[PDB]
Design a protein around this ligand. Sequence first.
Ligand SMILES: COC(=O)N[C@H](C(=O)NN(CCC[C@@]1(Cc2ccccc2)C(=O)N([C@H]2c3ccccc3C[C@H]2O)C[C@H]1O)Cc1ccc(-c2ccccc2)cc1)C(C)(C)C
Lengths: 99, 99
Amino acid sequence: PQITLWQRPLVTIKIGGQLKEALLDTGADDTVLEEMSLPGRWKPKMIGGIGGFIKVRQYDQIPIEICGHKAIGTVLVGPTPTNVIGRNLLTQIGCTLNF
Amino acid sequence: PQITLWQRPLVTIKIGGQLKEALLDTGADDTVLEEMSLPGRWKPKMIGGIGGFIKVRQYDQIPIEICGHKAIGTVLVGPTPTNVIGRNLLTQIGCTLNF
Ligand SMILES: COC(=O)N[C@H](C(=O)NN(CCC[C@@]1(Cc2ccccc2)C(=O)N([C@H]2c3ccccc3C[C@H]2O)C[C@H]1O)Cc1ccc(-c2ccccc2)cc1)C(C)(C)C
C-alpha cells in the first residue's frame, strides 16, 4: 500500500513471538530494536547517529513479519530510544520511496 | 521517481546556491544539515537521536531544492554525521513509501 509521511510511518511487526511497534526508517542501514531476547549467535557492534554512539548486539538471519510480509534479516538490539526498521529489511518487502 | 533501498537513498540538494549530498530519511521528523551558513535569525532547538540529544540552530522559511523539487521550510543546523532530509520536507515534495 501507500504510506504518506504527514505522520511518523509506524507499523506493527512480529518478531520472536512478540508484537512490537516500529518506525519505517529509510535512513537506517539496519533494523534496531529496544532490549529483547533473540536466539542464535550475535556479535557486539557500535552504531552512531545523532547524539553519538550506542552499543548493540547484532543478530543475523532473524525471521520477521511486517505488514503481512514474512522476511528475514539482521536485527540490532540495544538501548535505542525507538524501534526502527531499516533498509536491510525494507528491501525484502519491496518498499520504495516515490515522489 | 522511484527509489529502491538496496543502497542509501542519497540525493543532491541545493541550498544557498550550493549543491550538497543528503539522505532521504523517513524516520526523521526534521531536516538537519551539517554546519553551514544561513541568512536571518535562528531559534534554539534540542533534538533526540539514537545516541542522545544535540543542540541545533533552527532556521525557518528557507528555500531548498531536493532532487530538483522546490521546497521552502525549516532547516536545522548542527553536529550530524550526514545531511538528513526529514518528513517536514519529504511531505513538501510529495514523497511517500510504497510496497
Ligand atoms: C523525534 O525525533 C526525530 O525524528 N529525530 C531524528 C532521529 O534521529 N530519528 N530516528 C530515526 C533516524 C536515525 C538515524 C539518523 C541518521 C541518518 C543519516 C546519517 C546519520 C544518522 C540513525 O541514527 N542511524 C544510524 C543507524 C541505524 C541502524 C544501523 C546502523 C546505523 C548507523 C547510523 O547511520 C540511521 C538513521 O536511521 C528515530 C528516533 C525517533 C525519536 C527519538 C526520540 C526518543 C525520545 C525522546 C526524543 C526523541 C530518537 C530517534 C533526528 C534526525 C531529527 C534527530
